[PDB]
Amino acid sequence: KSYFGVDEMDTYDPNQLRYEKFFFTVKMTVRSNRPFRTYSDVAAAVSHWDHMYIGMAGKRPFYKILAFLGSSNLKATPAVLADQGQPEYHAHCEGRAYLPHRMGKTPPMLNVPEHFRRPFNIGLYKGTIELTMTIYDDESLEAAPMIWDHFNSSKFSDFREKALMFGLIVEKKASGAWVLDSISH
Amino acid sequence: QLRYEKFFFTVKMTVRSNRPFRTYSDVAAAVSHWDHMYIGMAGKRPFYKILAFLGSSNLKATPAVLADQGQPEYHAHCEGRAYLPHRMGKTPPMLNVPEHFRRPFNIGLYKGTIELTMTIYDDESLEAAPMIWDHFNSSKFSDFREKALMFGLIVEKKASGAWVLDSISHFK
Amino acid sequence: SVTVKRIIDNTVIVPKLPANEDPVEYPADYFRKSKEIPLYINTTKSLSDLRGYVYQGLKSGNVSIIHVNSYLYGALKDIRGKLDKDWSSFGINIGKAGDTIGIFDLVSLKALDGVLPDGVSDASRTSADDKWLPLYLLGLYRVGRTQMPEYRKKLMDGLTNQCKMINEQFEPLVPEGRDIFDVWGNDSNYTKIVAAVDMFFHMFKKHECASFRYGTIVSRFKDCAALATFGHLCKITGMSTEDVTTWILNREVADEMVQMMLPGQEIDKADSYMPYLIDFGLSSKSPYSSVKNPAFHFWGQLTALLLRSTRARNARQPDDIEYTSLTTAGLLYAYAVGSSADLAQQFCVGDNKYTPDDSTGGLTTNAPPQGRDVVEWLGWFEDQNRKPTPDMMQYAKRAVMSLQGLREKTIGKYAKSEFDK
RNA sequence: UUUUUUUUU
The missing domain is CATH 1.10.3610.10 (Nucleoprotein)
Known part of the structure; x- marks a missing residue:
């Protein structure tokens, strides 16, 4: 508006709720020392999985949501209990979910795996993250659950805060569930 | 906007577990998350939660427990006509078909399974009915809102005189 | 024509011919009916996204044709030149002596429609790599036309030398294994772009960016x-x-x-x-x-x-x-x-x-x-x-x-x- | 699928 002629309206109305169903599969591993106290550190550490993103664009919101889901329900390995020298955290998930979003329009997907592996160093904590994901659209007529429903929430509190920890701005519509707004980045 | 929506309701609640429950707080904690993975009608989602509250108020034992203490088990059943004031806006049309859910609950000390069979559908009759909020047995105290929040249901106890349903973010 | 009558009955017949072949056409008949050479492309995505898509697709070897077409369109658009004479052909005119023209001022542009594929995006691609990327793609088009290993490797070594003499420390993309870009010759917009580029850089041979013509000389x-x-x-x-x-x-x-x-x-x-x-x-x-x-x-x-x-x-x-x-x-x-x-x-x-x-x-x-x-x-x-x-x-x-x-x-x-x- | 100097900045 500060200039003239810089688009008008955008009649196509990208700003509107759109639903997207898809199968998801996830597997995550985290390695470090000085074993891992509290959940805020989980978000802080995993937030550096895409420092230099080289993945298939258009899937960034889905990948971020998926990393959040995987970080939510990660189960520590017995070695953490037995030895504290080199703990390890593992996670694995798979299912079919449908997400509402208003980012835009997603092109056709594909059933290809994607691997990411990066080191991290956040203050006292240092180590490695290694994820492997596979998302692909589903054209069936099943009644899948909402992706948010897959979060139990009996650990950690508030979804706006947590969605911001990962770089994700969402909304809290009174009569429904959380809908995406944009990626803060 | 204070919208009064009428419906007939039927509810059948069952809980199975070991370590038989002692305090109502533990039972409420177990039942609050009966919908880990909801695949029902979206537009009826909040209403079901209200009905779960009713089931909590109607927790009962059975002769099975008196027959053996190593298979804790509670039953409950309710049904009738009611209408609810709400500020969620407008609800879609509702059908008369049964719905069922069964989930495992794992809170540490208490572990087991929870089963809920609900059927909520429109009340096309034109006759007056009591308040759905004035239908429970929790005359008790003013902590109805505390119980709802512990479930995760936001209600108002202001001069309106009722416990009207308020909002979502029931997840916490 | 000639008449051949059946002798015994005196009847009249006209022996025609079989057609296993296909008919013939002349360029004049195209400009006698419609006067615009269409060209369909996509312009929704910015230049940096297309750069990332092309570079990464080529590194992995699963690049899409539409993205390459759009990248060549968005790269060969700030190049221009002077103009000496009165260019005209088959009842068409282009400019007049004493003005400037581009490379896509020879064909009419329009809007491609339909869903588009995806890519593998990158967020580190210096601008300096545009000098040689269109040249690399045109050289790939050229080398992907002859099915012979010796000729193919000689031509790709010439191409690598061409890229080196400009932006040495350039490295080969599209590795020596799974072969790509050999299906692109079946497409219509890529060859239109190549032909227009070849003609433009053939008329103006003194242009400083003429080295692109290394990749388009087989098309004339x-x-x-x-x-x-x-x-x-x-x-x-x-x-x-x-x-x-x-x-x-x-x-x-x-x-x-x-x-x-x-x-x-x-x-x-x-x-x-x-x-x-x-x-x-x-x-x-x-x-x-x-x-x-x-x-x-x-x-x-x-x-x-x-x-x-x-x-x-x-x-x-x-x-x-x-x-x-x-x-x-x-x-x-x-x-x-x-x-x-x-x-x-x-x-x-x-x-x-x-x-x-x-x-x-x-x-x-x-x-x-x-x-x-x-x-x-x-x-x-x-x-x-x-x-x-x-x-x-x-x-x-x-x-x-x-x-x-x-x-x-x-x-x-x-x-x-x-x-x- | 065209093509038909293992010719060509």
Whole structure:
């Protein structure tokens, strides 16, 4: 508006709720020392999985949501209990979910795996993250659950805060569930 | 906007577990998350939660427990006509078909399974009915809102005189 | 046409022909109906996203065609130049002397429709890598046209050198394993872009970015290798075009000549759309191809082969053509031109032009006639029957005595098989 | 699928 002629309206109305169903599969591993106290550190550490993103664009919101889901329900390995020298955290998930979003329009997907592996160093904590994901659209007529429903929430509190920890701005519509707004980045 | 929506309701609640429950707080904690993975009608989602509250108020034992203490088990059943004031806006049309859910609950000390069979559908009759909020047995105290929040249901106890349903973010 | 009546009944019939082949089209017929060469592209994504998509797809080797088309469109758009003359062709006009033009000012742009594929995006791609990326892609297009490992590797090593001399520390993309970009030749917009680029950088050869033309030189004379042969024969013979077209002596190359020489279809205009008829889509089957003019091609290249020509031992040998009749005419013409040298006065000082003093002669025997004219050669050939002279065959054999390289089903192979005997 | 110098900045 500060200039003239810089688009008008955008009649196509990208700003509107759109639903997207898809199968998801996830597997995550985290390695470090000085074993891992509290959940805020989980978000802080995993937030550096895409420092230099080289993945298939258009899937960034889905990948971020998926990393959040995987970080939510990660189960520590017995070695953490037995030895504290080199703990390890593992996670694995798979299912079919449908997400509402208003980012835009997603092109056709594909059933290809994607691997990411990066080191991290956040203050006292240092180590490695290694994820492997596979998302692909589903054209069936099943009644899948909402992706948010897959979060139990009996650990950690508030979804706006947590969605911001990962770089994700969402909304809290009174009569429904959380809908995406944009990626803060 | 204070919208009064009428419906007939039927509810059948069952809980199975070991370590038989002692305090109502533990039972409420177990039942609050009966919908880990909801695949029902979206537009009826909040209403079901209200009905779960009713089931909590109607927790009962059975002769099975008196027959053996190593298979804790509670039953409950309710049904009738009611209408609810709400500020969620407008609800879609509702059908008369049964719905069922069964989930495992794992809170540490208490572990087991929870089963809920609900059927909520429109009340096309034109006759007056009591308040759905004035239908429970929790005359008790003013902590109805505390119980709802512990479930995760936001209600108002202001001069309106009722416990009207308020909002979502029931997840916490 | 001609009438053929059934003798026994006197009935009238008209024998038609089968058509296993496909019909013929001329460029003039495209500009006689519609006057705009369409070109469809996508412009939704910015330049950096397309850069990332192209670079990463090529590194992995799963790049999409549409993204490459859009990248070439978004890269070759700030290049321009001056303009000397009045460019025009087939009733079209482009600019006027004393202005500036771009590279896509030759074809009309529009909006492609339909869903689009995805890519693998990158967030670190310096701008400096645009100097050579279009060049790399055009070189890939060029090298992906010949199915031969030796030639392919020689051409790709030339391409790598071309990229190196500009942006050394450049590294090869599209690794040596799974082969890509060989299906792109089947697309229509990529070839239109390549042809437009080739024409533009061919007219303005002094441009500083002319090195792109390394990748588009195969696109100019495509499917038109019958005109090239005619020109090469005209140059080797050294005579004018009238004497060359006179020396045919059979109505099979003449049919092709009549098919190739029509009022429209302006030839000899370097700044025209003629050579790029194929890529731009102006014609499906070009009338100058070698599959519809086999007799002309074979006769021309055999005449060239029998006159000590270099580009004769690597041509192909099309089949379904009667070699006995074209071969005899080609041999006769080759002997005629290579057995009599025309000497005479060319420039004369004032009223002193030398006149040939030849009215008394003794060439009534079988010996050859002096000068070069079909009238006097057909007479000598007829008077000496159709049998080639032993001297003619000796000349033919000594003309093809030594040949090092030969390839199966080549005109060189045929000549060494029949004439070297 | 066209093509038909293992010619070509």
